């Protein structure tokens, strides 16, 4: 098939400053930082993932870099480069608002219908691109959607390609992963958004989900959802994978809705709700001179 002509950019350690720790766990530690290419007179806000050295860990971080460097879409997270220190470091464009799951939980009192519907379009665009690239995500969830600006989200953690509660029925029973099992997870992601970060099948142990789905029970209709929106989620949760919507259809359907959002989502005090915007002033710590976003920096 087609040769993967993606460029793997190797970055010098001396070209990037670590500022603060955004997270830490099993994967290692993620830092907020700046990338300053020598003589370029640019400072690019970045997220840096660093790993002690073991041959197993290094193999895993490089498979992640291969996938991340292979994608290029406005609604998918891309790798900027890698740093070849003792433990390999992955450099990515900073998504300053964090992940969508925590964003909806923390900002539920100001998330209006235009935002939820546009996020649904953006995630479907990202997913439709991954489909054109024949790349099955396998882990789509609201936690794996990053927020660049409240009006611009990008999918991530497709680079690892078990979350039973987001998985399709063919995936649970037979470990069948396709672009149509990705549609089921998309339906769950939408449910997460529409409920402002609620946990799907909360308090129901994972080893029971398969039987629940086989009996025909599904996630409930969120209070803000009209039957129009809920029918879409229900269509993502059909047993027949071919019956589920295509991402191309999801972009269209949610875009139609996004044009008259209050007809499709019923949110109390929707028209007086507001989030930060790049059309606003003061939207953009120490020296903020010469900083450019990675989306506007090309070579
Ligand atoms: C905030 N932001 N902006 C771009 C990327 C990220 C980010 N990446 C993460 N994991 C990564 N996965 N792959 C990477 C490559 C380079 C840098 C980071 C990662 C993780 C998080 N955020 C949190 C703290 C929300 O949890 C983990």
Question: Can you give keywords for this protein?
Answer:
two-stranded antiparallel ribbon, 299 residues, Transferase(Phosphotransferase), domain 1, monomer, Epidermal growth factor receptor, Phosphorylase Kinase, domain 1, binds ligand 5N4, 2 domains
In short:
With 299 residues, this protein is of the alpha+beta class. Helices cover 31% and strands 14% of the residues. It has helices spanning 55-69, 100-107, 113-132, 169-174, 179-194, 209-215, 227-236, 247-258, and strands at residues 16-24, 29-35, 44-50, 79-83, 89-93, 145-149, 152-155.
Annotated CATH topology of the largest domain: Transferase(Phosphotransferase), domain 1
Percentage of residues assigned to helices:
25-40%
Ligands present: the ligand Cn1nccc1-c1nc(Nc2n[nH]c3ccccc23)c2c(n1)C(C)(C)OC2
The CATH homologous superfamily of the largest domain is named: Transferase(Phosphotransferase) domain 1
Order of helices and strands: EEEHEEHHEEHHHHH
Protein name: Epidermal growth factor receptor
Subcellular location: Cell membrane; Endoplasmic reticulum membrane; Golgi apparatus membrane; Nucleus membrane
Family: Belongs to the protein kinase superfamily. Tyr protein kinase family. EGF receptor subfamily.
